[PDB]
Design an enzyme around this catalytic site. Structure first.
Site, short mmCIF file in Angstrom:
data_model
loop_
_atom_site.label_atom_id
_atom_site.label_comp_id
_atom_site.label_asym_id
_atom_site.label_seq_id
_atom_site.Cartn_x
_atom_site.Cartn_y
_atom_site.Cartn_z
N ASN A 43 -42.51 -104.23 -60.86
CA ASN A 43 -41.73 -103.00 -61.00
C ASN A 43 -40.61 -103.14 -62.04
O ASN A 43 -39.49 -102.71 -61.74
CB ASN A 43 -41.15 -102.32 -59.74
CG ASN A 43 -42.14 -101.51 -58.93
OD1 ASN A 43 -42.21 -101.67 -57.70
ND2 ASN A 43 -42.92 -100.66 -59.59
N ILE A 45 -46.59 -93.77 -51.65
CA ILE A 45 -46.18 -93.50 -50.29
C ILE A 45 -46.24 -92.00 -49.99
O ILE A 45 -45.35 -91.35 -49.46
CB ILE A 45 -44.76 -93.98 -50.10
CG1 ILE A 45 -44.55 -95.35 -50.72
CG2 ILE A 45 -44.33 -93.93 -48.63
CD1 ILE A 45 -43.09 -95.79 -50.67
N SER A 94 -50.47 -102.73 -50.56
CA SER A 94 -49.32 -103.11 -51.31
C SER A 94 -48.40 -103.80 -50.33
O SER A 94 -47.99 -103.17 -49.37
CB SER A 94 -48.65 -101.84 -51.88
OG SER A 94 -47.56 -102.06 -52.76
N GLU A 107 -48.56 -106.36 -62.62
CA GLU A 107 -48.18 -104.99 -62.80
C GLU A 107 -46.75 -104.78 -63.29
O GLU A 107 -45.77 -105.09 -62.59
CB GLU A 107 -48.36 -104.23 -61.45
CG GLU A 107 -48.99 -102.83 -61.53
CD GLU A 107 -48.93 -102.11 -60.21
OE1 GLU A 107 -49.25 -102.64 -59.16
OE2 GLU A 107 -48.47 -100.88 -60.28
N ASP A 149 -47.88 -99.59 -65.24
CA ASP A 149 -47.75 -98.49 -64.37
C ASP A 149 -46.77 -97.51 -64.97
O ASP A 149 -47.11 -96.47 -65.52
CB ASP A 149 -47.28 -98.99 -62.99
CG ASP A 149 -46.78 -97.90 -62.09
OD1 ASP A 149 -46.78 -96.72 -62.38
OD2 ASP A 149 -46.37 -98.36 -60.94
N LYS A 151 -51.37 -93.03 -61.73
CA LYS A 151 -50.54 -92.36 -60.78
C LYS A 151 -50.40 -90.99 -61.30
O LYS A 151 -49.88 -90.79 -62.40
CB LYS A 151 -49.18 -92.99 -60.70
CG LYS A 151 -49.05 -94.07 -59.65
CD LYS A 151 -47.64 -94.63 -59.59
CE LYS A 151 -47.57 -96.01 -58.94
NZ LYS A 151 -46.24 -96.42 -58.49
N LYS A 207 -51.79 -106.94 -52.83
CA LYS A 207 -50.90 -106.78 -53.92
C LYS A 207 -49.56 -107.11 -53.38
O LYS A 207 -49.22 -106.67 -52.28
CB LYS A 207 -50.97 -105.38 -54.52
CG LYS A 207 -49.65 -104.85 -55.03
CD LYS A 207 -49.78 -103.55 -55.79
CE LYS A 207 -48.44 -102.83 -55.78
NZ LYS A 207 -48.50 -101.55 -56.45
N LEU A 208 -48.87 -107.95 -54.12
CA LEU A 208 -47.59 -108.45 -53.69
C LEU A 208 -46.47 -108.03 -54.59
O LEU A 208 -46.50 -108.32 -55.79
CB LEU A 208 -47.65 -109.97 -53.66
CG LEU A 208 -48.65 -110.50 -52.68
CD1 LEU A 208 -48.94 -111.96 -53.02
CD2 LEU A 208 -48.04 -110.37 -51.29
N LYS A 209 -45.47 -107.33 -54.02
CA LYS A 209 -44.30 -106.93 -54.79
C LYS A 209 -43.57 -108.18 -55.24
O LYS A 209 -43.31 -109.09 -54.46
CB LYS A 209 -43.35 -106.01 -54.03
CG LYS A 209 -43.86 -104.62 -53.77
CD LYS A 209 -44.38 -103.93 -55.01
CE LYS A 209 -44.43 -102.42 -54.86
NZ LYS A 209 -44.58 -101.76 -56.16
C1 LIG Z 1 -41.68 -96.39 -55.51
S1 LIG Z 1 -42.98 -97.48 -54.90
C2 LIG Z 1 -43.93 -97.80 -56.42
C3 LIG Z 1 -44.80 -99.04 -56.32
C4 LIG Z 1 -46.21 -98.74 -55.81
N1 LIG Z 1 -46.70 -99.35 -54.58
C5 LIG Z 1 -46.65 -98.69 -53.28
C6 LIG Z 1 -47.88 -98.49 -52.42
O1 LIG Z 1 -45.51 -98.24 -52.84
C7 LIG Z 1 -47.07 -99.20 -56.92
O2 LIG Z 1 -46.50 -99.90 -57.86
O3 LIG Z 1 -48.33 -98.91 -57.01
MG LIG Z 2 -46.38 -100.39 -59.76
#
Ligand SMILES: CSCC[C@H](NC(C)=O)C(=O)O
Ligand SMILES: [Mg+2]
Ligand SMILES: CSCC[C@H](NC(C)=O)C(=O)O
Ligand SMILES: CSCC[C@H](NC(C)=O)C(=O)O
Ligand SMILES: CSCC[C@H](NC(C)=O)C(=O)O
Ligand SMILES: [Mg+2]
Ligand SMILES: [Mg+2]
Ligand SMILES: [Mg+2]
Lengths: 368, 368, 368, 368
Positions: B191, B293, B135, B214, B239, B263, B161-163
């Site tokens: 997110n 994390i 990530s 995502e 997610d 998750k 994977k790119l935020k």
């Molecule tokens: C509060 S972080 C939530 C986002 C997380 N990625 C990572 C590895 O931190 C994810 O979307 O899978």
């Molecule tokens: Mg996510």
């Protein structure tokens, strides 16, 4: 685990009272038992197949053949064995769910005992005991039928299930409802005896307040059930049709089912059966445990299963005596229309050698 | 089992490198850890909440309270306990999935250890190692971002994977596709940063051949996702929206999701998470393991889960060092883009006391 | 405006008679109160959260924490404050609607009293009074119920609501319909107590002519209600499920609702409540005011909301004395099945200090 | 308040440059103004109707009439008057939205001005400035057009709207895209000029990357727009068809619109407008402010409006000087493509009498 070998046993058990269905009569029960053998201990599995391919395409001798030549071998061959891995291991063989489920069980039984864990714990039981109902066969006469129901009803059974056949539908019901009242838990089972073209007939039962109608139409006729559901008031319940979780997901998606009967071997394993339970659950579909007139071995795995959270309807998990005078294990005894969920590792039951030998007709050892 | 009590710890781990998401920049990770005490032995659970309620409503201090005043107590007050009965036991309390999942975790570990079983065995693993992606946060510069990508790419990580965020979408992606090529596993994570009105901008990523996008939209906007999906070429992955197996089934039915990121803490526990896996699986929806994390504790549990059959996509189960210099457990180490699934009973791991104590900020005992 | 600080107050108010819901019984009423301080004047707010997370995942202590730590401070931070800006200022924090609603209100009340405008004015009232019904708990007996019903009918209550629960459905209903007649305004409330699998029993209520069934199923089960709605006659109403205007829209869109219970705190503020109103209206969905056993404070702004144009069904706005012997405000007295909408600026009412302090357990200041 | 009377003016402002629509050329603007006269203070109103019945069946003189004879009177007769109540008060009268709009507007202004509140405040503004784009008429030539555009582009306008008509579609577009670039906010406006049978021609625009096509077909042709939206890439925007919140709801439900143009008068007020916004928002439908060649009287209100949350796109809120050389109020000046939201009570703007009287062409008292 490492698979050492398996012992295939044929077993004949006389029924206390002949059991008639849309596909016929059953006076005697031939089964197939498996004894899984690993360096650590033993595991037992039961196959729901029957003599002939009547309920399904799977029959005892065919199960034997595949297990022998294809399935078992396949597993022996594998380095490390896990119940879970069985699936993937046997994946290459199309079908033979019942047989594959029998094998899985044996293995799982062993696997669990090894960790000292019951089928119930693995499966995820939330109860200790489970409401039992009973499946009543087709009769030759209405009183004969009524006497029987009164019979079971007295024993404490919590639900009454009627096998139907064109010719034994409305009447039989009209009768029980009349005699026994409207508060009983009644439901019927066609075992595929009808056609969409029999709708009116089936709509004839709307009045009777049944909980469900089990597999009115053939196994492949999902859509048809969906349609049928449209024309009748009695809720559709699938059996034969549900050979997997995905089947259940599809049938639910299509509106072909409202309640699902779970039969572990039909779906190829107690493992798959958990998923099915889980899938249905997610969709708001209620499940209940079905029965294959098993010995105390499957009966015991089924009771464990039936104690899962979505089994919100009584199962065909009758007491041992309903079919057998003498069960190869410690019999199952109805207590307050309930059965207790075994507590020991694995099945939580074992065959009484003596007993087992009495009812065995053949044997064989499959080792590498 | 019978719950004796639970110890509540507050840990504080520094981040190797600040972590930027659409919700904010993170330098230090504050966790909440649980040690469930039983006649049998201890068990460990990790909570994914964070300092504030930014990803969800759940936050550390809140979980603690609820745990302390409602959930723990309620379990303590039961006669028998099973990881599986935890759910029904805590059902009277609305929400708090994250907190619930932690507790069930602790229970489950402790229970698994007793039966000398592994999370992975329990969950149904069919794999002994798992592909790991990485990530990649939000960068201040593209170069910066490109280096980092390059770095991770070298460590041997299987997918990227790119935020994303409004103002950090198509460029950062165009650039990485630019440098690194078209044969890399690339996907993005908003997110919940976008709106349906943003479809056009998101439509801009169509060309990059991403695996998925995502959570483009808010947690409650399913229908929006189903719509949004009709507007873009990039497949939808949810997610925050998947808070249950039922959520999953609903969204799938509505065409709002094509791939699910599981998750465990987000869905109320490893057990629930298995169910999601199974539901998706039955609807042909691929899943892949999410990551919050976690320490080795949660990391361990996740690797196990991620080894299940339907996880046909690399998860966010990176190596320990990706986030933490010093993990409180044996560290997770990337071997050929993979991570090895734990073999011991329960989590297959535990905290190194001296390590744990260093990071521990607060502790409390919750007994009867 | 300019936020000077907020005074958190804890309030305990004994019930006039224990109030029983599917989630349990309630003899006392802990509440949260907020006094918004501006250089100009004061504002009041009331939170609907209860002792614990039984109705929702929100609870008194939980709301206080978030208010204190996250929400209040986030507003004080802001240069210029408008009740409208509250939203977007608090947006970063996920969920926490009940709390968020109280604060808004607190703010709003100030802002209005400052423009010398009434909640009713701003909200867009069209009436001067509103018809009130009453929420009737779960009794110990049927007679006990009946007295009670009758008791209320005489006070002048316009409509009757019956909290239901498995085991307290049909009968308690059968009774009131029978005894009290067929022209009584009757509806039930299962506070999420059923399951789709319970449809049939809920179908058992078709005959009584109830106006609606409030929240038969879990909060998250919207598709379930839509399905449900296809199996019973009794129109569906949602409360818990409706957390926003968007939630409304979706529900409606999906065929899972026909009438909407509006609970301002539930939805996160009176402002959003308005929005829901307008959304429902645009879709031809009737709404009605829901109650959360509030003080005169909440009760007042609700009567204001209840006066909007689409509130076309008697709300839960019962007179003060239906719960509380002594209100912290000037009681709400039922004048021929109605209540008068306040006329002053802001809420229109204020705490009768001497009355507050007598029932105030805690107090805190939240300044810069 | 208490309505004391309404002064009706006619006004005639000469356009800076003739404005050509698919409905006809425009050289001068003839408006209808309203002076609400209360005991407290006065309020302003501005009717969007035009000289003849061209955009919709409403026209200046028809307006007057209904106002004078039906509308105005209705309100005067009322004891109590609140802008909210105007709607129920004028319900009995079928249609005439622009007229009711203008009136409400006048009332609102007064009311707000009496609470010292802004239009903005009441509507719920969240911004302080809004992003403005412009409406570019039908030219006689391409070059002509291009010039203008670049003309408008230079002044700082954020987005460009191009009036279209069979024969003025693709080309003009092709030209502005070509010359000005692709990263220009471009959108069109057929003012009902096409038919479903023209889909193919309209499909011809697909390529240009327009933000939307506004009202391609008739007012009443919702379903046709839905079908249309199926045959074209360009997102459908509705104007004329959006006569209410309901209509929005429905059009959206049917998939006939993806963006919504809000015209306060067209919908029957500012109130309703707000609602449409709300509705649209709840359905993830972006909105943007529409303009009817208004004075600094309508311009103001709009600007306020345009500052609502869901106003995700740049409005037709061009600066005063885009049409008028000398406004009757303080003019509106583009500040970096933006236009400040008025801070004073009520509209926050008034007509400069000297200026007003200059343009007025008639007058009339309407009291009791
Ligand atoms: C509060 S972080 C939530 C986002 C997380 N990625 C990572 C590895 O931190 C994810 O979307 O899978
Ligand atoms: Mg996510
Ligand atoms: C070997 S007959 C199988 C059919 C079965 N009946 C019972 C009662 O076992 C059922 O459909 O539930
Ligand atoms: C404290 S539970 C509140 C539920 C509420 N009833 C009333 C009468 O307030 C309702 O109709 O949902
Ligand atoms: C005479 S204008 C009618 C149509 C209008 N254009 C402008 C610039 O106001 C619009 O579509 O918003
Ligand atoms: Mg059957
Ligand atoms: Mg309710
Ligand atoms: Mg237009």
């Amino acid at each position: 685990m490492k698979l050492s070998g398996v012992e295939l046993r044929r077993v004949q058990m006389p029924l206390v009272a002949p059991f008639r269905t849309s596909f016929g009569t059953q006076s005697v029960r031939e089964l197939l038992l498996l004894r899984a053998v690993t360096p650590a201990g033993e595991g037992w599995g039961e196959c729901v197949t029957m003599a002939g391919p009547l309920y399904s395409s799977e029959y005892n001798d065919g199960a034997e053949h595949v297990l022998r030549h294809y399935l078992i071998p396949a597993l022996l061959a594998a380095e490390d064995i896990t119940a879970a891995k069985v699936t993937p291991l046997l994946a290459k063989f199309k079908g033979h769910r019942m047989a594959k489920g029998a094998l899985e069980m044996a293995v799982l039984d062993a696997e669990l005992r090894a960790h000292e864990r019951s089928f119930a714990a693995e499966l995820g039981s939330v109860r200790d005991s489970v409401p039992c109902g009973v499946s009543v066969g087709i009769m030759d006469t209405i009183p004969q039928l009524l006497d029987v129901v009164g019979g079971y009803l007295d024993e404490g059974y919590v639900r009454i299930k009627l096998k139907i056949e064109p010719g034994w539908d409305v009447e039989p019901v009209r009768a029980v409802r009349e005699r026994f009242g409207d508060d009983v838990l009644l439901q019927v089972d066609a075992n595929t005896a009808y056609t969409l073209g029999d709708a009116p007939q089936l709509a004839r039962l709307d009045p009777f307040g049944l909980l469900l109608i089990e597999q009115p139409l053939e196994e492949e006729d999902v859509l048809g059930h969906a349609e049928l559901a449209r024309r009748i008031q009695t809720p559709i319940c699938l059996d034969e049709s549900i050979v997997s979780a995905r089947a259940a997901a599809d049938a639910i998606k299509l509106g072909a089912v409202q309640i699902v009967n779970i039969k572990p071997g039909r779906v190829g394993g107690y493992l798959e059966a958990r998923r099915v339970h889980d899938v249905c659950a997610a969709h708001g579909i209620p499940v209940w445990c079905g029965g294959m007139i098993e010995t105390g071995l499957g009966r015991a795995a089924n009771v464990a299963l039936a104690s899962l959270p979505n089994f919100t309807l009584p199962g065909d998990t009758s007491a041992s005596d309903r079919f057998y005078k003498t069960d190869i294990t410690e019999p199952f005894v109805l207590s307050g229309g309930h059965l207790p969920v075994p507590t020991g590792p694995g099945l939580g039951v074992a065959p009484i050698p003596e007993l087992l030998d009495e009812v065995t007709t053949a044997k064989v050892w499959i080792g590498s």
